[PDB]
Design a protein around this motif. Structure first.
Motif, PDB file in Angstrom:
ATOM      1  N   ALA B  20       0.832  -1.195   0.000  1.00  0.00           N
ATOM      2  CA  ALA B  20       0.000   0.000   0.000  1.00  0.00           C
ATOM      3  C   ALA B  20       0.871   1.252   0.000  1.00  0.00           C
ATOM      4  O   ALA B  20       2.045   1.225   0.389  1.00  0.00           O
ATOM      5  CB  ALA B  20      -0.950   0.028   1.206  1.00  0.00           C
ATOM      6  N   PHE B  36      -4.576 -13.222   0.255  1.00  0.00           N
ATOM      7  CA  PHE B  36      -5.393 -12.121   0.760  1.00  0.00           C
ATOM      8  C   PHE B  36      -6.727 -12.030   0.023  1.00  0.00           C
ATOM      9  O   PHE B  36      -7.772 -11.791   0.646  1.00  0.00           O
ATOM     10  CB  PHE B  36      -4.613 -10.812   0.652  1.00  0.00           C
ATOM     11  N   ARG B  60     -15.177  -0.447  14.792  1.00  0.00           N
ATOM     12  CA  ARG B  60     -14.162   0.580  14.618  1.00  0.00           C
ATOM     13  C   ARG B  60     -13.562   1.053  15.937  1.00  0.00           C
ATOM     14  O   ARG B  60     -12.808   2.030  15.944  1.00  0.00           O
ATOM     15  CB  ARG B  60     -14.757   1.768  13.857  1.00  0.00           C
TER      16      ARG B  60
HETATM   17  C1  LIG Z   1      -0.156  -2.021   4.494  1.00  0.00           C
HETATM   18  C2  LIG Z   1      -1.342  -1.961   5.421  1.00  0.00           C
HETATM   19  C3  LIG Z   1      -2.134  -3.069   5.608  1.00  0.00           C
HETATM   20  C4  LIG Z   1      -3.245  -3.037   6.468  1.00  0.00           C
HETATM   21  N1  LIG Z   1      -3.985  -4.181   6.608  1.00  0.00           N
HETATM   22  C5  LIG Z   1      -5.015  -4.134   7.412  1.00  0.00           C
HETATM   23  C6  LIG Z   1      -5.794  -5.295   7.575  1.00  0.00           C
HETATM   24  O1  LIG Z   1      -5.540  -6.342   6.996  1.00  0.00           O
HETATM   25  N2  LIG Z   1      -6.871  -5.229   8.422  1.00  0.00           N
HETATM   26  C7  LIG Z   1      -7.193  -4.090   9.085  1.00  0.00           C
HETATM   27  O2  LIG Z   1      -8.180  -4.133   9.820  1.00  0.00           O
HETATM   28  N3  LIG Z   1      -6.471  -2.956   8.959  1.00  0.00           N
HETATM   29  C8  LIG Z   1      -5.429  -2.972   8.158  1.00  0.00           C
HETATM   30  N4  LIG Z   1      -4.666  -1.832   7.996  1.00  0.00           N
HETATM   31  C9  LIG Z   1      -5.011  -0.605   8.739  1.00  0.00           C
HETATM   32  C10 LIG Z   1      -6.049   0.259   8.048  1.00  0.00           C
HETATM   33  O3  LIG Z   1      -5.856   0.208   6.641  1.00  0.00           O
HETATM   34  C11 LIG Z   1      -5.823   1.701   8.512  1.00  0.00           C
HETATM   35  O4  LIG Z   1      -4.607   2.175   7.942  1.00  0.00           O
HETATM   36  C12 LIG Z   1      -5.754   1.869  10.033  1.00  0.00           C
HETATM   37  O5  LIG Z   1      -7.012   1.539  10.629  1.00  0.00           O
HETATM   38  C13 LIG Z   1      -5.283   3.242  10.461  1.00  0.00           C
HETATM   39  O6  LIG Z   1      -6.231   4.082  11.195  1.00  0.00           O
HETATM   40  P1  LIG Z   1      -7.519   4.730  10.459  1.00  0.00           P
HETATM   41  O7  LIG Z   1      -8.441   3.576  10.119  1.00  0.00           O
HETATM   42  O8  LIG Z   1      -8.107   5.697  11.466  1.00  0.00           O
HETATM   43  O9  LIG Z   1      -6.990   5.433   9.225  1.00  0.00           O
HETATM   44  C14 LIG Z   1      -3.557  -1.843   7.151  1.00  0.00           C
HETATM   45  C15 LIG Z   1      -2.742  -0.716   6.949  1.00  0.00           C
HETATM   46  C16 LIG Z   1      -1.652  -0.763   6.103  1.00  0.00           C
HETATM   47  C17 LIG Z   1      -0.795   0.460   5.905  1.00  0.00           C
END
Ligand SMILES: Cc1cc2nc3c(=O)[nH]c(=O)nc-3n(C[C@H](O)[C@H](O)[C@H](O)COP(=O)(O)O)c2cc1C
Ligand SMILES: Cc1cc2nc3c(=O)[nH]c(=O)nc-3n(C[C@H](O)[C@H](O)[C@H](O)COP(=O)(O)O)c2cc1C
Lengths: 133, 133
Positions: B20, B36, B60
């Motif tokens: 990502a 995945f 959340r």
């Molecule tokens: C490379 C990458 C992989 C992620 N994979 C997952 C995942 O498999 N499951 C998940 O629940 N969140 C995953 N996340 C986290 C969410 O995409 C998100 O970045 C995270 O919740 C950060 O806080 P926000 O939701 O407030 O932006 C991943 C983040 C990154 C950068």
């Protein structure tokens, strides 16, 4: 996808990843990642160009050996749970995945190995079975 | 190691691997592997260019979000166990490892995600602890 990212993904993997090539009855290692070095306890310079059977140590009577040989000879991926020993001598349970892949650059088949330490889950399941009594 | 072998090593990985990129507060998906795709129940076309937070659904209220967010800001890898929901709605436990890596092709930091399903072990630890008392 860029090659540097793929190498980083291999270098960032929690499970051990290795690449080996066939030399007769030996499949000598040509690449290991950091995870493999920390799982096995051996440095890169020591185990390079060596068949992974050293992880078995003296426990060389594992039926999975024959299954591995059959799978690699027939060009099939295989999965075996084995008992392996680190450099210090401590034992662990290794879920090994072997995948044969044909490289088009040189028309040579290489073998990709993925090692997972599953000692924790083995102990957990055993303890659950004990409590079941 | 050639890129074809690296793509094979990634596509043969037991754990899920994704890549990502950062777009403000979103980390948009640019690559997923087969594991995945079948774990989440979504195809590549559905989840392309979207942040993985949709896997959280309505649950959340997970503290790991904050920890994840800080770790990426400082360029540190992090490991968190989170609750996620598939496309059909079934729940599972994900041990996620995020690793920032510097791509030299564009001097841009990308984020590698490794997902391991720990539901079986979660249930094992639950039952072992319950019976443990
Ligand atoms: C490379 C990458 C992989 C992620 N994979 C997952 C995942 O498999 N499951 C998940 O629940 N969140 C995953 N996340 C986290 C969410 O995409 C998100 O970045 C995270 O919740 C950060 O806080 P926000 O939701 O407030 O932006 C991943 C983040 C990154 C950068
Ligand atoms: C890529 C690759 C990785 C391997 N990794 C391991 C390993 O981590 N532990 C192990 O006990 N055997 C491992 N093996 C299997 C042994 O190296 C060996 O090929 C197999 O036991 C065949 O047994 P033999 O050499 O006695 O015929 C691996 C094989 C390959 C091709």
């Amino acid at each position: 996808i860029n090659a540097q990212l793929l190498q980083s993904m291999v270098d960032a993997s929690n499970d051990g990843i290795v690449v080996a090539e066939k030399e007769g009855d030996d499949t000598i290692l040509i690449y290991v990642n950091a995870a493999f070095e920390y799982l096995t306890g051996y440095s890169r310079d020591e185990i390079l160009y060596q068949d992974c059977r050293f992880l078995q140590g003296d426990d060389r009577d594992q039926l999975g050996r024959a299954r591995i040989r059959k799978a690699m000879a027939e060009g099939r991926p295989c999965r075996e749970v084995l008992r392996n020993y680190r450099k210090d001598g401590s034992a662990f349970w290794n879920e090994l995945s072997i995948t044969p892949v044909k490289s088009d650059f040189d028309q040579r088949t290489y073998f990709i190995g993925i090692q997972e330490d599953v000692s924790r889950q083995v102990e957990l399941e055993r303890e659950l079975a004990e409590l079941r009594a």
